[PDB]
Symmetry: D3
Subunit: 152 residues, 6 copies
């Protein structure tokens, strides 16, 4: 089902440190997307190495894993029609310098090395990231009281 | 006369149901546009059919009219320089998927059939829509205390 | 029947002029109260004299009526459990100096003669005020999609 | 770091709070205040967990309905840390009955009826210890130092 | 003139550091109070010793002066009816633990040693504090476009 | 600290921005973004200062009206610091003509006409150097380290 598409959203250590957890969740709630998974955690080096597995031979890999391990993250799963693509639009460009005002990165951060947030770039990546960060039983299913007013 | 241009804005039944009336009015107030007409109403079938005359031969027409009738709407008239054009920009693209963050549809909705809001697409359409939804006596004329700081 | 209690709320000419219409409506929406009636209007002298009948022999009466006539008002009807009592709490004390931060008057105004807003002081007053400002056909009945999550 | 500034409380967003889209707003209020996030999870509370949580109310006539309702929808379970989090957290939430809750508080701004009061907070430090231990495993609690700590506490 | 009463408001180093300058000014603007003085500065030890002159023989004096000198402050003057007393209400109790939700300290800080903000406790103190922190020519006089809608 | 992250820009809230109560909102947007406050003052700009600021437009037919208007009301003069503040500051402000400004930007959200466009920002680093030196004395610029610096810049 197209309306039941899901994406992985992670608030990075700098997003948590700068007090942006509430603001970010509010953006997704007000949009009409439904929360399915939410977790406050410190990501282990093993998990981060698997998450950034495509970049393991790149020279910035050690510093990237170290930084994402240096503070707690907020791992999330959101559900909705085209939530992967729309979620990325809501976040803005990965490089905050190119992010537009009104987007999460556009409003709240400056440098790409400290870009507060991550979102799945595709449905394929979403399935991989959700399975890696979340256990199946940590994902909650329910129907929003506003479902009929959000979707036809 | 250019600063006295008027447009019709309607908050659709899903906009009312999802509690977005105040948020939407705030957007137009803070911009500097002047409120002219405002009423909470259930639109009759005859009114809606006349409002969507250009779409009467479309396959969606019957369901579209029935839905706009399914719940109460907030009918509005706003005044300002290029209020028709800039009003549409503030609302965002008709399809919420193409609507940018910062716009009303971009921030608050997902699906085209549940796109919370309507705005006149032209000056000609605005004049027709205002006269259709509002009696002349319902439109209030006053001068904003900030007029000299909004316009030269 | 207790959850179906109704109150009259009016945004005064200074509330409209200072761009507080959206902010005020948002306060009632987010609380969980249901919009029943809403209209933008210039109140006639006859209507205002009847609205302030209990104050007709007061020295301020003439200037008070003239001022409420000097600019357009937003007349509203809201529905909910103890909406009359809690509505007054949300508005704050009649004198803004005694109004607490968090209330409408406490946050947004200074002087008693320019106190942005009116709310019915009793159920009896509410019924009189609603019938005075609104025709029965202008009051819209619908069920909020969140009704079961606001009330038992 | 002073031990007094490291007090913990349990805050839970109820099913109606989740349904009405208040999760982000509630978290924001604790964040902007200066309190630090320790635990956070999205969950459907099991009947066993709810029976143990409302153990003092087991003999009451509406106990069956209370457990059933709190099980009907998902909740957001949270642990927050700060100087007197328990006491001031209750102040931020407002009175349990929303009719007596003041504007500016969470219940005062966002809900109407006591049966649908969107949120819960520990009434005491003793209750906080019990509630955190019941709802969270020790591994789920994350300890970190806020970059603003020196500007929140002397 | 009662409407021309003025008070001194200072955002403390922790208020600046925690990014609250904008939020605080917004509170006073939306209330209807008029900005007359605004300055970003690092307060010298000489100025702080004179500001806290009544406490110079107390054992906490050295630490208090040192802290208020450790970071930049935002010094402000605001004008309005009973702005001194009302300003203090808007700030909330000096000890944030006793500050109510909706007030500046109630919403944004925790401990009295880091209470983000200061406001004059009396008209007498206001005159003394404004004269100490500001030069007469740094105070700007103008009339708000909304004056007639804020005051009778 | 990297020199690149220490770029400075001049931002001025115009008399209409002050009149319409947008001072707090504008400052908030720069604060929440992560940019650091360097200079801030409330002032009525003198005719001499405005003539030097708009020196490139001195021969234009509406120069007399422009100086007169900018002198009629008080302004908020600001200096902000951060990585590419000049460029991104302009993006945050939106297009000079508010008709072309996008929602989410300062001009896009809050104003309508080009003659009353509430705000100004330096168009280049060269302009920033000139504008800061003209509007501010070196003593008025305050240097401090943000507690969040390590979480804004690597």
């Amino acid at each position: 089902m197209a309306n039941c598409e899901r994406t992985f959203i992670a608030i990075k250590p700098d997003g948590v440190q700068r007090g942006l957890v509430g603001e970010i969740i509010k953006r997704f709630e007000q949009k009409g997307f439904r929360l399915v998974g939410l977790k406050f955690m410190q990501a282990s080096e093993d998990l981060l190495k698997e998450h950034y597995v495509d970049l393991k031979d790149r020279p910035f890999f050690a510093g990237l894993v170290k930084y994402m391990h240096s503070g707690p993250v907020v791992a999330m799963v959101w559900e909705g029609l085209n939530v992967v693509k729309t979620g990325r639009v809501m976040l803005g460009e990965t490089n905050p310098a190119d992010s537009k005002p009104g987007t999460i990165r556009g409003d709240f951060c400056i440098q790409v090395g400290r870009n507060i947030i991550h979102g799945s770039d595709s449905v394929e990546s979403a399935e991989k990231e959700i399975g890696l960060w979340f256990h199946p039983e940590e994902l909650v299913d329910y129907t929003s009281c506003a479902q009929n007013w959000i979707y036809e």
